[PDB]
Amino acid sequence: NMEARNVMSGTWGELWLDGNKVAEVKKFQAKMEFTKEDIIIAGQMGTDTKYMGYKGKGSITLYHVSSRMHKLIGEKIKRGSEPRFVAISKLNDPDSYGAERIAVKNIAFDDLTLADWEVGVKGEIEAPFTFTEYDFLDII
Amino acid sequence: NMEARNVMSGTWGELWLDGNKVAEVKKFQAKMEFTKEDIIIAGQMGTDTKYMGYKGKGSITLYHVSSRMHKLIGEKIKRGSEPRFVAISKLNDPDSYGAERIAVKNIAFDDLTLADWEVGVKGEIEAPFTFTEYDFLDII
Amino acid sequence: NMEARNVMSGTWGELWLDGNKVAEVKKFQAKMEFTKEDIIIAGQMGTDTKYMGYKGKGSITLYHVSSRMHKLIGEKIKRGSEPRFVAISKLNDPDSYGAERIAVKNIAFDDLTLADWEVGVKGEIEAPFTFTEYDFLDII
Amino acid sequence: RNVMSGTWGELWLDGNKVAEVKKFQAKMEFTKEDIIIAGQMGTDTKYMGYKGKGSITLYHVSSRMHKLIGEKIKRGSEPRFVAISKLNDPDSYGAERIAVKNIAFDDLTLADWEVGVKGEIEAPFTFTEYDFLDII
Amino acid sequence: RNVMSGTWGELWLDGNKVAEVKKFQAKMEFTKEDIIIAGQMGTDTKYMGYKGKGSITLYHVSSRMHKLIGEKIKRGSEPRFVAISKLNDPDSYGAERIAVKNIAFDDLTLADWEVGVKGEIEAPFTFTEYDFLDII
Amino acid sequence: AIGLPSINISFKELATTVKERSARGIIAMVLKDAKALGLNEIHEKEDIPVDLSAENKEYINLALMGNVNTPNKLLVYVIEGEADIQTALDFLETKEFNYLCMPKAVEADKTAIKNWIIKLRDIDKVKVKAVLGKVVGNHEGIINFTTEDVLVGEKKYSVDEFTSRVAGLIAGTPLSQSVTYTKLSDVVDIPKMTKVDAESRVNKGELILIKEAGAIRIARGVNSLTELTAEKGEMFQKIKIVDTLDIIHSDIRKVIIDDYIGKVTNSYDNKCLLIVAIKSYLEELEKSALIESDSTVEIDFEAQKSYLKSKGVDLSYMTLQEIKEANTGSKVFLKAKIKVLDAMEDIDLSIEI
Amino acid sequence: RKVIIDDYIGKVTNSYDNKCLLIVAIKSYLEELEKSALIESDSTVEIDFEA
């Protein structure tokens, strides 16, 4: 069953942002942080916790091929309106057992990078975000 | 008595999660953190402590062979119900004196990783958890 | 479409400060930090956030060719008046799809470096700042 | 008593006999960790694993390696092979055979030539498990 | 049976035949990562990609490389080329051709000479994709 | 060719099953009757020939009950009232199956069936088994069920008639489990038998029924083989082990007979290649936990030695390597060693006060 | 049948992504039917592998 070839590789992923495929993508990450409170119950030494909710966090890093991130939110942010996007990530490795796809919804971005460059260094742009919902599509 | 060969090696461990053997396991760790309060007693310079309880913590790291972690809790978390699992760890080195087995109970996980990949990097998923109880089985 | 040659290089940037081109520039960075507050809505586990504003931050690093930074603000700071400047950054890589230009306005500097040198080390001066407004010129 | 000469060497790769083969070599390298035990000057070691390494050297008679792995390497799937080595010197008493399994090749040589020099190709490889046939 | 000799080697660069060529070499090097699986002593590897590398060696008959890339290198735009290598020894049964695409050169040699020595130029390069013609 | 564009939506209720049939397990029955002559495969209950008599219907219905899963398929061959068994056996040689039983039979015909099974297993090396009424054969391919007057419902079924239910129950068992101590709901009562007599009877090598614990159950899953050679093992008496071994032997045929027969020169190098192929096949079976690890495949030295001695070869002063390098005309001798785990059937618990 | 005929026959190219979009549309229709409580909420749509 388990073999080295079965491990998925990041080179085979791809990402759709707002319905448009992003080709200059370096990495994509999403996570859900649960909220738990400590509760001490009389007569038991081990402490136990109660689950209350979750918080979603993530980030996207991409090569600075084009000024894509500005056109999305630059003018809207100043006016006072915040847009919400939908991202889809697909990871399809030929060696592994098929592919898994996930849709991340209600994405709101944390910051906007107007300019970042240095002499002798290639350019990169990373943007963190927060989300609320998700779907499972073709999970393994 | 003491010899180099007697030291246990991590390559020989294995982990059962919810009754199903996990083959793509990288490391497993469990620990108990005691709670102690400082108490100053008149006439003695050395401070003494009183033990009040313990807290259990740990984590699991495993290769991203398949989307196992989603199927366990992904849909249940959104609805508002938290599941509890049982894990068994066995460490059986042929050179050492036999094997030791431990069951860790009432496991509740801290976070869920929807997606994490980067170009040119193999995928890995680490999940921390907290527990309350444990058993000893075939301790050396 | 996507190719390695399309990535912008920082060697091709240039910076205008107060209408005068700065040739001894090493790096330039501008960013906008949004302000978001957590809001818990009854009946939903996932937390949602409300956007309230943004804060702009950045920095300039340049070789210590001449005492440019003193002549701008050194005498004005002591008297009690704070000047505001305008910076323009242009990134023009022949391989990439054209060039992008951005004007950053209402710049106020954080500190002034009177002297900084060490034996056997070439000199450099970095100055961080904060801004409020920006324009898009020839965005890609 | 005589020592086996390498002239009498044959190689089977992927079930096909390799007519041209200059040399063959396969080795297992162990992994050890230093452990210092209290009260002892001498330092001991603990064996924690092993790695398999080897290489082939064959004349450039045909384009075997490309037909083997070229398209699959581009597609993104890496193939694994099995190789058999036989060493039977008539002077020596018996023969020796080894089966090497789960072979993966380190590189591919598209073309290499020079004026006045016959072409040679060498391809290193890494393996996991071996089996032994006709042990002397 | 005969092994192809490198004397019968021809090279086409950017659609022009290179009259003077001492040797040509192109190779694909794979990228692998070590993976340790619980319960197994042997260590396995996962293939993650490859790199194309090679070089040329030609006599200093003319100033070809400068006319190729010199001004574009200064301007800031890097050109890419395609090279074709053919090896056809009359003694051997068939010929072999390879098309190497997306070539980028590592360096440029403006001038190099010494008293009593004929000039030689060698230019390494890196490529991405290859295509095969007239397989043996 | 090309038709008009079509959009068709189909609704079907594929939920009509219970006690689903296993992929493995094929039973072949041969019967004497006046109608429905020839082979009539029976996939399930709804497709039963109507022209058959009541006795054949009862026998088929008995054979249609399994242990956990129903048998995959049933091949019912009908012969005329006065006919010889040779024609049916020759017809069945073409077909493939796992078990063969005949409800109504005589003492003389059982000898023919046993002889055919022995010849098929040994000479032709095709692994099939038969369940017989009272045969005392000493072969692993023969199963004799020797309890009488079974009361299923209100009829005193004969032993030969109940061999059909025995065969169905054997075919229904999954690979992991065994047939020991399996309860038969249909059976009501058994003729009286004392414990020591039943133990001696099963020790002799027999398939019997006993009343133990809640209800009636099979005493043991032994075979008819009652004596052990040095080459033969004590694990060959168990039915489950033999079934797994025969499954493996039939499976390796698609590797051996498909390609290596009549298409490859018989040279020692090709023998080594075939050995490597067989070992690589066995590794996959090991990885699925069907058999235990450390299974070795190598040249059968003793059989090759015997064949060489059969012809004009002086086996003296020949090296063992020289013996192995010998070209044995157009025949290949191989030997494999595999282990199969048995089921829990005995427990010894000691308690300290 | 009406939904498929109106917008998909002859207007899109038979690629995997378009197949996924059509699957999403059918799933959305079934989810809409769910809120009226005519069927159950466990509906799944995917490619007919065997055909």
Coordinates of N, CA and C in Angstrom, one line a residue, chain C residues 6-131:
Chain C
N6 N 9.2 36.3 -17.7 CA 8.2 37.3 -17.5 C 8.3 37.9 -16.1
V7 N 9.1 37.3 -15.2 CA 9.2 37.8 -13.8 C 10.0 39.1 -13.8
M8 N 9.5 40.1 -13.1 CA 10.2 41.3 -13.0 C 11.4 41.2 -12.1
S9 N 12.4 42.0 -12.4 CA 13.7 42.1 -11.7 C 13.8 43.4 -11.1
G10 N 14.3 43.5 -9.8 CA 14.4 44.7 -9.1 C 15.6 45.6 -9.6
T11 N 16.4 45.1 -10.5 CA 17.5 45.9 -11.0 C 17.0 47.0 -11.9
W12 N 15.8 46.8 -12.4 CA 15.2 47.8 -13.4 C 14.3 48.8 -12.8
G13 N 14.2 48.9 -11.5 CA 13.4 50.0 -10.9 C 14.1 51.3 -10.8
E14 N 13.3 52.3 -10.6 CA 13.9 53.7 -10.3 C 12.8 54.4 -9.5
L15 N 13.3 55.5 -8.8 CA 12.5 56.1 -7.8 C 12.7 57.6 -7.9
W16 N 11.6 58.4 -8.0 CA 11.6 59.9 -7.9 C 11.1 60.3 -6.6
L17 N 11.9 61.1 -5.9 CA 11.6 61.7 -4.6 C 11.5 63.2 -4.7
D18 N 10.3 63.7 -4.4 CA 10.1 65.2 -4.5 C 10.4 65.8 -5.8
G19 N 10.2 65.0 -6.9 CA 10.4 65.5 -8.2 C 11.9 65.3 -8.7
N20 N 12.8 64.8 -7.9 CA 14.2 64.6 -8.2 C 14.5 63.1 -8.3
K21 N 15.1 62.6 -9.4 CA 15.4 61.2 -9.5 C 16.5 60.8 -8.5
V22 N 16.3 59.7 -7.8 CA 17.2 59.2 -6.9 C 18.0 58.0 -7.6
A23 N 19.2 58.2 -7.9 CA 20.0 57.2 -8.6 C 20.7 56.1 -7.7
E24 N 20.9 56.5 -6.4 CA 21.6 55.6 -5.5 C 20.6 54.8 -4.6
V25 N 19.7 54.2 -5.3 CA 18.6 53.5 -4.6 C 18.9 52.0 -4.5
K26 N 18.6 51.4 -3.4 CA 18.8 49.9 -3.2 C 17.5 49.2 -3.2
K27 N 16.5 49.6 -2.4 CA 15.2 49.0 -2.4 C 14.1 50.0 -2.0
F28 N 12.9 49.8 -2.4 CA 11.7 50.6 -2.1 C 10.6 49.7 -1.9
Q29 N 9.8 49.9 -0.8 CA 8.7 49.1 -0.5 C 7.6 49.9 0.1
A30 N 6.3 49.7 -0.3 CA 5.1 50.3 0.2 C 4.1 49.3 0.4
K31 N 3.2 49.5 1.4 CA 2.2 48.5 1.8 C 1.1 49.2 2.5
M32 N -0.1 48.5 2.5 CA -1.3 49.0 3.2 C -1.8 47.9 4.1
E33 N -1.9 48.3 5.4 CA -2.3 47.3 6.5 C -3.8 47.6 6.8
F34 N -4.7 46.7 6.5 CA -6.1 46.9 6.8 C -6.4 46.7 8.3
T35 N -7.4 47.3 8.7 CA -7.9 47.1 10.1 C -9.2 46.3 10.1
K36 N -9.3 45.2 10.8 CA -10.4 44.3 10.8 C -10.7 43.9 12.2
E37 N -12.0 43.9 12.5 CA -12.5 43.5 13.9 C -13.3 42.2 13.8
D38 N -13.1 41.3 14.7 CA -13.8 40.0 14.8 C -15.2 40.3 15.2
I39 N -16.2 39.6 14.5 CA -17.6 39.7 14.9 C -18.2 38.3 14.9
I40 N -18.8 37.9 16.0 CA -19.4 36.6 16.2 C -20.9 36.8 16.0
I41 N -21.4 36.0 15.0 CA -22.8 36.0 14.7 C -23.5 34.8 15.2
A42 N -24.6 34.9 15.9 CA -25.3 33.8 16.5 C -25.8 32.8 15.5
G43 N -25.5 31.5 15.7 CA -25.9 30.5 14.9 C -24.9 30.0 13.9
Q44 N -23.7 30.6 13.8 CA -22.7 30.2 12.9 C -21.4 30.1 13.7
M45 N -20.7 28.9 13.4 CA -19.4 28.7 14.1 C -18.3 29.6 13.6
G46 N -18.2 29.7 12.3 CA -17.1 30.5 11.7 C -17.2 32.0 12.0
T47 N -16.2 32.6 12.5 CA -16.1 34.0 12.8 C -15.9 34.8 11.5
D48 N -16.6 36.0 11.5 CA -16.5 36.9 10.4 C -16.0 38.3 10.9
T49 N -15.4 39.0 10.0 CA -14.7 40.3 10.3 C -15.3 41.4 9.5
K50 N -15.1 42.6 10.1 CA -15.6 43.9 9.5 C -14.4 44.8 9.3
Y51 N -14.3 45.3 8.1 CA -13.2 46.2 7.7 C -13.5 47.6 8.0
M52 N -12.5 48.3 8.7 CA -12.7 49.6 9.2 C -11.8 50.7 8.7
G53 N -10.6 50.3 8.2 CA -9.7 51.3 7.6 C -8.4 50.6 7.3
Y54 N -7.4 51.4 6.9 CA -6.1 50.9 6.5 C -5.0 51.9 7.0
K55 N -3.8 51.3 7.1 CA -2.7 52.1 7.5 C -1.5 51.7 6.5
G56 N -0.8 52.8 6.1 CA 0.2 52.6 5.1 C 1.6 52.7 5.7
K57 N 2.5 51.9 5.3 CA 3.8 51.8 5.8 C 4.8 51.4 4.7
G58 N 6.1 51.8 4.9 CA 7.1 51.5 3.9 C 8.4 51.9 4.4
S59 N 9.4 51.8 3.5 CA 10.8 52.2 3.8 C 11.6 52.3 2.5
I60 N 12.7 53.1 2.6 CA 13.6 53.3 1.5 C 15.0 53.0 2.0
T61 N 15.8 52.2 1.3 CA 17.2 52.0 1.6 C 18.0 52.4 0.4
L62 N 19.1 53.2 0.6 CA 19.9 53.8 -0.4 C 21.3 53.8 0.0
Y63 N 22.2 53.8 -0.9 CA 23.7 53.9 -0.6 C 24.0 55.3 -0.1
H64 N 25.0 55.3 0.7 CA 25.4 56.6 1.3 C 26.3 57.4 0.4
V65 N 25.8 57.7 -0.8 CA 26.6 58.5 -1.7 C 26.7 60.0 -1.3
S66 N 25.6 60.6 -0.8 CA 25.6 62.0 -0.5 C 24.7 62.2 0.7
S67 N 24.8 63.3 1.3 CA 23.9 63.7 2.5 C 22.6 64.3 2.0
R68 N 21.8 63.5 1.2 CA 20.6 64.0 0.7 C 19.5 64.1 1.8
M69 N 19.4 63.1 2.7 CA 18.3 63.0 3.6 C 18.4 64.2 4.6
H70 N 19.5 64.7 4.9 CA 19.6 65.8 5.9 C 19.0 67.1 5.3
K71 N 19.4 67.4 4.1 CA 18.9 68.7 3.5 C 17.4 68.8 3.4
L72 N 16.7 67.6 3.4 CA 15.2 67.7 3.3 C 14.6 68.1 4.6
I73 N 14.9 67.5 5.7 CA 14.1 67.7 6.9 C 14.9 68.1 8.2
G74 N 16.2 68.1 8.1 CA 17.0 68.3 9.3 C 16.7 69.6 10.0
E75 N 16.6 70.7 9.3 CA 16.4 72.0 10.0 C 14.9 72.2 10.3
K76 N 14.0 71.6 9.4 CA 12.6 71.8 9.7 C 12.1 71.0 10.9
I77 N 12.7 69.9 11.2 CA 12.2 69.1 12.3 C 12.4 69.8 13.6
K78 N 13.6 70.5 13.8 CA 13.9 71.1 15.1 C 12.9 72.3 15.3
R79 N 12.5 73.0 14.3 CA 11.6 74.2 14.5 C 10.2 73.8 14.8
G80 N 9.8 72.6 14.5 CA 8.5 72.1 14.8 C 7.5 71.9 13.6
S81 N 8.0 72.0 12.4 CA 7.2 71.8 11.2 C 7.6 70.5 10.5
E82 N 6.6 69.7 10.1 CA 6.8 68.5 9.5 C 6.4 68.6 8.0
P83 N 7.4 68.3 7.1 CA 7.0 68.4 5.7 C 6.4 67.0 5.2
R84 N 5.8 67.1 4.0 CA 5.2 66.0 3.4 C 5.7 65.9 1.9
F85 N 6.0 64.7 1.5 CA 6.7 64.5 0.2 C 5.8 63.6 -0.7
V86 N 6.2 63.4 -1.9 CA 5.6 62.6 -2.9 C 6.6 61.8 -3.6
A87 N 6.4 60.4 -3.7 CA 7.4 59.5 -4.3 C 6.7 58.8 -5.5
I88 N 7.5 58.5 -6.5 CA 7.0 57.8 -7.7 C 8.0 56.6 -7.9
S89 N 7.5 55.4 -8.1 CA 8.2 54.2 -8.3 C 7.9 53.6 -9.7
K90 N 8.8 53.4 -10.5 CA 8.6 52.8 -11.8 C 9.5 51.6 -12.0
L91 N 8.8 50.5 -12.4 CA 9.5 49.2 -12.6 C 9.3 48.8 -14.0
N92 N 10.4 48.9 -14.8 CA 10.4 48.7 -16.2 C 11.3 47.6 -16.6
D93 N 10.9 46.3 -16.7 CA 11.7 45.2 -17.2 C 11.4 44.9 -18.6
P94 N 12.5 44.9 -19.5 CA 12.3 44.7 -20.9 C 11.6 43.3 -21.2
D95 N 11.8 42.3 -20.4 CA 11.2 41.0 -20.7 C 9.8 40.9 -20.3
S96 N 9.4 41.6 -19.2 CA 8.0 41.5 -18.7 C 7.1 42.3 -19.6
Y97 N 5.8 42.2 -19.3 CA 4.7 42.9 -20.1 C 4.7 44.3 -19.7
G98 N 5.6 45.1 -20.3 CA 5.5 46.6 -20.0 C 6.0 46.9 -18.6
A99 N 5.6 48.1 -18.1 CA 6.0 48.6 -16.9 C 4.8 49.1 -16.1
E100 N 5.0 49.2 -14.7 CA 4.0 49.7 -13.8 C 4.5 50.9 -13.0
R101 N 3.7 51.9 -12.8 CA 4.2 53.1 -12.1 C 3.1 53.5 -11.1
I102 N 3.6 53.9 -9.9 CA 2.7 54.2 -8.8 C 3.2 55.4 -8.1
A103 N 2.3 56.3 -7.7 CA 2.7 57.5 -7.0 C 2.2 57.4 -5.5
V104 N 3.1 57.6 -4.6 CA 2.7 57.5 -3.2 C 2.8 58.9 -2.6
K105 N 1.7 59.3 -1.9 CA 1.5 60.7 -1.5 C 1.5 60.8 0.0
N106 N 1.7 62.0 0.5 CA 1.6 62.4 1.9 C 2.5 61.6 2.7
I107 N 3.8 61.5 2.2 CA 4.8 60.7 2.9 C 5.4 61.5 4.1
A108 N 5.4 60.9 5.3 CA 6.1 61.4 6.4 C 7.1 60.4 7.0
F109 N 8.3 60.9 7.2 CA 9.4 60.0 7.6 C 9.4 59.7 9.1
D110 N 10.0 58.6 9.4 CA 10.0 58.1 10.8 C 11.2 58.5 11.6
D111 N 12.4 58.6 11.0 CA 13.6 58.9 11.7 C 14.6 59.6 10.7
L112 N 15.6 60.2 11.3 CA 16.7 60.8 10.6 C 18.0 60.2 11.1
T113 N 18.9 59.8 10.2 CA 20.2 59.2 10.6 C 21.3 60.2 10.4
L114 N 21.8 60.7 11.5 CA 22.9 61.7 11.4 C 24.2 61.1 10.9
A115 N 24.6 60.0 11.5 CA 25.9 59.4 11.2 C 25.8 57.9 11.5
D116 N 26.4 57.1 10.6 CA 26.4 55.7 10.8 C 27.6 55.1 9.9
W117 N 28.7 54.7 10.6 CA 29.8 54.1 9.8 C 30.5 53.2 10.7
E118 N 31.3 52.3 10.1 CA 32.1 51.3 10.7 C 33.3 51.0 9.9
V119 N 34.4 50.6 10.5 CA 35.6 50.4 9.8 C 35.5 49.1 9.0
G120 N 35.9 49.2 7.7 CA 35.8 48.0 6.8 C 34.4 47.7 6.2
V121 N 33.4 48.6 6.5 CA 32.1 48.4 6.0 C 31.6 49.5 5.1
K122 N 31.1 49.3 4.0 CA 30.5 50.3 3.2 C 29.2 50.9 3.8
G123 N 28.9 52.1 3.6 CA 27.8 52.8 4.2 C 26.5 52.7 3.5
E124 N 25.4 52.6 4.3 CA 24.1 52.5 3.8 C 23.1 53.2 4.7
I125 N 22.0 53.7 4.2 CA 21.1 54.5 5.0 C 19.7 54.0 4.6
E126 N 18.9 53.6 5.6 CA 17.5 53.1 5.4 C 16.6 54.0 6.2
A127 N 15.5 54.5 5.6 CA 14.5 55.4 6.2 C 13.1 54.9 6.0
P128 N 12.4 54.5 7.1 CA 11.0 54.1 7.0 C 10.1 55.3 7.0
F129 N 8.9 55.2 6.5 CA 7.9 56.2 6.4 C 6.5 55.7 6.4
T130 N 5.5 56.6 6.5 CA 4.1 56.3 6.5 C 3.4 57.2 5.5
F131 N 2.4 56.7 4.8 CA 1.7 57.5 3.8 C 0.2 57.3 4.0

